[PDB]
Design a binder for this molecule. Structure first.
Ligand SMILES: Nc1ncnc2[nH]cnc12
Length: 261
């Protein structure tokens, strides 16, 4: 399994664009695509995972472990007192947990557990972060940089600190890779913090339905329209692939053939 590094401390728009491109190209199936949009692999393709190393301005890092089939963050590691400290979500199966241990921290004599004692659903992360909606957790490059430093090499931190980091990182890494729209929100706001708008949230929550709708579309027409939100919180009834393709970075894996095109 490969590691993609993003230097948050020295980030520029172009370096984030390159990061997104690299992450999409490592995660995607080598071949699968629908309507020109690359698709993630089935859950049997190896390697099953990708690592994403995030570097702060002090050169400390956190490495996220992502599942290729759905781009979920499974856990993260940091160097702590010389040790590979691995932090696994509590919703990972026994067999995948072994893989997380061994992928984040391959040397079994130099590693140390520090569990994430909660699941990785946004509802849970929001709860831990003290917010009723992740619209209330700002995203941004300086925020990500700061949050890495609250955790990496730090003996103890609160669940709120951890959940904030995870909400920021999940959205700026996995959601941005899945959605060019979200990558572009980061780029448009590159020099500042921002709050995810209703379209960011609607895309995040509907990626599986969107991916299925694109995979199933015939001659560019969705079989069933899909109702999303625009950035101004008005309904967006998507009728055609060409309406939503610009916002897409990766499709969730969907079995069967599609117009590739
Ligand atoms: N752990 C995770 N990783 C990626 N996307 C997510 N969406 C919700 N939780 C997530």
């Amino acid at each position: 399994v490969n590691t993609i590094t993003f230097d948050v401390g020295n980030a520029t728009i172009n370096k984030y664009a390159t990061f997104m491109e690299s992450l999409r190209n490592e995660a995607k199936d080598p071949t699968l695509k629908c309507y020109g949009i690359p698709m993630l692999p089935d859950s049997n393709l190896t390697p099953k995972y990708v690592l994403v190393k995030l570097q702060d301005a002090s050169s400390k890092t956190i490495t996220l472990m992502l599942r290729r089939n759905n781009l979920y963050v499974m856990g993260y590691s940091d160097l702590y007192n010389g040790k590979c400290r691995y932090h696994i979500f509590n919703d990972i199966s026994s067999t995948e947990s072994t893989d997380v241990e061994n992928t984040l921290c391959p040397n079994s004599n130099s590693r140390e557990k520090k569990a994430i004692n909660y699941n990785s659903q946004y509802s849970t992360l929001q709860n831990k972060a003290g917010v009723s909606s992740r619209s209330q957790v700002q995203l941004g490059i300086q925020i990500l940089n700061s949050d890495i430093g609250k955790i990496s090499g730090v003996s103890t931190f609160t669940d709120k600190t951890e959940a904030e980091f995870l909400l920021v990182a999940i959205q700026m890494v996995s959601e941005a890779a899945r959605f060019k729209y979200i990558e572009n929100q980061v780029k448009t706001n590159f020099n500042r913090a921002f709050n995810p708008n209703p379209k960011v949230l609607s895309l995040e929550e509907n990626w599986g339905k969107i991916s299925l709708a694109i995979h199933n579309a015939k001659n560019g027409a969705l079989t069933s329209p899909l109702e999303l939100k625009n950035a101004d919180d008005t309904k967006w009834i998507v009728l055609r692939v060409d309406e939503i393709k610009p916002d897409m970075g990766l499709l969730n894996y969907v079995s069967g053939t599609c117009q590739t095109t």
